[PDB]
Amino acid sequence: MELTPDQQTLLHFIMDSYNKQRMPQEITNKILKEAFSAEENFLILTEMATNHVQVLVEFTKKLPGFQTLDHEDQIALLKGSAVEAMFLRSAEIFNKKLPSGHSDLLEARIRNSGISDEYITPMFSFYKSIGELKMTQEEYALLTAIVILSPDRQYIKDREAVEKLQEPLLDVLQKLCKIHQPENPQHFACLLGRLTELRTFNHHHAEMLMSWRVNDHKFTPLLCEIWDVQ
Amino acid sequence: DHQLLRYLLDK
Numbered sequence A: 001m002e003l004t005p006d007q008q009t010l011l012h013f014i015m016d017s018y019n020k021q022r023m024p025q026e027i028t029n030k031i032l033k034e035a036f037s038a039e040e041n042f043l044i045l046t047e048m049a050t051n052h053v054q055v056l057v058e059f060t061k062k063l064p065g066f067q068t069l070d071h072e073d074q075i076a077l078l079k080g081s082a083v084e085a086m087f088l089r090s091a092e093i094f095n096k097k098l099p100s101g102h103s104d105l106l107e108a109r110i111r112n113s114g115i116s117d118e119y120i121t122p123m124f125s126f127y128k129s130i131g132e133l134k135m136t137q138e139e140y141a142l143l144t145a146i147v148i149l150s151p152d153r154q155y156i157k158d159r160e161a162v163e164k165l166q167e168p169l170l171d172v173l174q175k176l177c178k179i180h181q182p183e184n185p186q187h188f189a190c191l192l193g194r195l196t197e198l199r200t201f202n203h204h205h206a207e208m209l210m211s212w213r214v215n216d217h218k219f220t221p222l223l224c225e226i227w228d229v230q
Numbered sequence B: 001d002h003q004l005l006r007y008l009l010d011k
C-alpha cells in the first residue's frame, strides 16, 4: 500500500534528476511576453528542443540500470523516446496554473506559432487529455522515465533487460496513484492509457516540423540525429 | 549514425 524505503529513495532520486530541467516559467514568460513571427518561433523551437535532448540524455543516464544496458539498445531507447518526452514535457508546462486569461493567451500564441493547422488539433487534444489527469510533478517525472524505458521500442534487441528496469518505476507510480487519488481507482490506468496517444506524435513529427510556415527548415546536428530531418 | 547521441551517452 505505502511507499517502501527503496521506493522512497527511487522517487526522490528521480525527482532530483527531473529537477535539472529548464524551469517552466522561463518558457511561458517568453511566449506570453510578445508575439513572434513563424520564423522566430521555429528558431525558439529548435533551440528549446536541442537543450531538451541534451537534458534528456543526462536524465536517462541516471535511470537505475540504464548504463548496464547494451549500448545499441541504449541508443534505440533514447532515439525512440525523445519526441514523446518532448511532447509530454510541453504538455506539463501547458497545464501549469497561470494568472487569469494567461493560459488562453499561451494557447493562442502556440496555435499561431507557425505549425500547420493540420497538427494543431491533435496537439491541443493531447495537452487537454493530459490536463484532465491533474498530474503532480512526481507523476510527470515517473511517466517520463517509464516512456524512456519502454521495452517494446524498435530495434531493441534485449527487451527483458528493459522490462526489468521499467517495472520498479511502474510500481512506484502505481502506489502514488492509489494514494493521490484513492477517489479514482482508475488514475493509474488512465495515466498509462495516455502513453498510447503520446506515441501517435512519432508518426508525423517530421511532417509537422517540415510543414512549419517558414521558407527554410534548419535543424541542428543533434536534432537531425534524433528527429530524422535534413 | 547517431554519432552525437553515442558521444553524449559515453562521454
Ligand SMILES: Cc1cc(C(=O)O)ccc1NC(=O)[C@H](C1CCCCC1)n1c(-c2ccc(Cl)cc2)nc2cc(F)c(F)cc21
Pocket (backbone or CB within 6 Å): A021, A022, A027, A028, A031, A041, A042, A044, A045, A048, A049, A051, A052, A055, A086, A087, A089, A090, A091, A093, A094, A095, A106, A110, A113, A115, A208, A209
Ligand atoms: C521543446 C520544449 C522543451 C522544453 C523543456 O526542455 O523543458 C519545454 C517546452 C518545449 N516546447 C516548446 O518550446 C514548444 C514551442 C511552442 C511554439 C513556440 C516555440 C516553442 N511548445 C510546444 C510544441 C509545439 C510544436 C512542436 Cl512540433 C513541439 C512542441 N508545445 C508547447 C506547449 C507549451 F505550454 C509551451 F510552453 C511550449 C510548447
